[PDB]
Structure formats: C-alpha cells, structure tokens
Amino acid sequence: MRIILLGAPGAGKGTQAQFIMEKYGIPQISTGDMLRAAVKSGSELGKQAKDIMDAGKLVTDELVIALVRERICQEDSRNGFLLDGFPRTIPQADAMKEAGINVDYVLEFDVPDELIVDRIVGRRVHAPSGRVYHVKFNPPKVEGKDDVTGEELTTRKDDQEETVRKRLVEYHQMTAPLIGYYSKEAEAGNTKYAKVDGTKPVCEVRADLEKILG
Numbered sequence: 001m002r003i004i005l006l007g008a009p010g011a012g013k014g015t016q017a018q019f020i021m022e023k024y025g026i027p028q029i030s031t032g033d034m035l036r037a038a039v040k041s042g043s044e045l046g047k048q049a050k051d052i053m054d055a056g057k058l059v060t061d062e063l064v065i066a067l068v069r070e071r072i073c074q075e076d077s078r079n080g081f082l083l084d085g086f087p088r089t090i091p092q093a094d095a096m097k098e099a100g101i102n103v104d105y106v107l108e109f110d111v112p113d114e115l116i117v118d119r120i121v122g123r124r125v126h127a128p129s130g131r132v133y134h135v136k137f138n139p140p141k142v143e144g145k146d147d148v149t150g151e152e153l154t155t156r157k158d159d160q161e162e163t164v165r166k167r168l169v170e171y172h173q174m175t176a177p178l179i180g181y182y183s184k185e186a187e188a189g190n191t192k193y194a195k196v197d198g199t200k201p202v203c204e205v206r207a208d209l210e211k212i213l214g
C-alpha cells in the first residue's frame, strides 16, 4: 500500500515504478516528475529546480517536502502511494516521520557503481509521456523515435555523463545513508525491508518484486 523505492541513480526505480503502479494500483509519487513538470509549465511550486536539476544537485529539502506534502493531500489516502525519488535525504525521511507517515515496505534497488553511468547516459525519454528508453538495454523500435507517437526522443540535461558523476557523488553523500536509515527502522519493526537485485533484466526484477509484494 505505502512503500518507498530506494536506489542509486539509474538503478531502475522509475521503470519498476510503472509496473508496481499497474499491478497493485497504488499511485506513483515521483519528485523528479513533479519538479520537471513544474519547470515545464513554470509552476511557482517547483519551477526553481530548473538550474539545479540540470546541474545535478539536489533540491532544497523543504521545497520537495512541501510538494510531496501537497501531492499526498490530493490523493485519497488509502489508495496508498509509491514514492520514487523521495525521501532523498535524512531530513526528508524525518519529515515523513514527524508527519506521521509510516510505510509498509522499503525496496532497495542495489546496483554496482560500474553500471550507473552507462544506464543513465544511454537513457532517452519521450518527455510529453514520461516513457523511458535505453539505447542498448531497452531500445525504441525505431532509433531516436518514440514507439507511440513517433516523435524524436530527447536526452535529459542531467543525463550528461559529467552531471551523472556529480549526481552519483551526491547520492553517496546525501541519499545512500537512507539504506541504513530504513534498515534500522525495519530492524525496529516499523517497516519491512527488501533488497532487490537491480542487475537482472527488467523481466526478472519485475518478477522479484511480485514475490516480495504479492
């Protein structure tokens, strides 16, 4: 019902987020989507993240805490949710604690650092639809084209390999301690942890998730 997806950038969280959404009918709350949408439409609550997402840095904890707080207040609460990209720092995890939001599962998408850069530099997306591709690991039917609309695919500005390394460094510094954060909470019986082998093909990763959830 209420689960958190953890993992290094490019571990595959967003890909498996689409599957968990359809299989179990819980909404996907992705801070990356909401910010990129707020920037695209110039929405006051998020448009400020433009220059710093393109730089590969993290958004101020307060700005995403409020956007998540506003997004969770929209949905019907027992529909559940599927957090993808949040929490990303210890203060963001403490915000959910203070706000009385307990989770049922934490799913860790473990992937070696040696795959991270290649997964992200090879990523292409269809921005209007959110569809995600990889040149090698999950390619479109036609090169550079979107499978549904035929429009020329795009590469996100922060998917430049240099910005990726800035992101991978910042992930190890600010976001990786959430693995020990929520593993301690699982050991306290406040949630249920689960590590997932993110190196498998997407077919098997989606199978491993099915066995963990239901």
Ligand SMILES: Nc1ncnc2c1ncn2[C@@H]1O[C@H](COP(=O)(O)OP(=O)(O)OP(=O)(O)OP(=O)(O)OP(=O)(O)OC[C@H]2O[C@@H](n3cnc4c(N)ncnc43)[C@H](O)[C@@H]2O)[C@@H](O)[C@H]1O
Pocket: 007, 008, 009, 010, 011, 012, 013, 014, 015, 016, 031, 032, 033, 035, 052, 053, 054, 056, 057, 058, 059, 060, 061, 064, 084, 085, 086, 087, 088, 119, 120, 122, 123, 124, 132, 133, 134, 135, 137, 138, 167, 198, 199, 200, 201, 202, 205
């Ligand atoms: N909470 C927050 N607090 C502060 N700032 C925030 C924030 N949230 C967002 N931001 C801001 O904006 C940016 C972060 O961007 P964000 O939108 O949060 O991350 P992505 O950029 O969405 O990165 P994940 O880190 O989400 O990658 P992914 O795990 O979803 O895997 P994916 O399926 O795409 O896969 C990677 C590529 O994977 C390929 N692939 C997928 N699965 C496999 C597989 N199984 N085998 C081989 N290749 C695979 C995928 O198809 C694709 O090609 C933040 O860094 C900051 O700038």
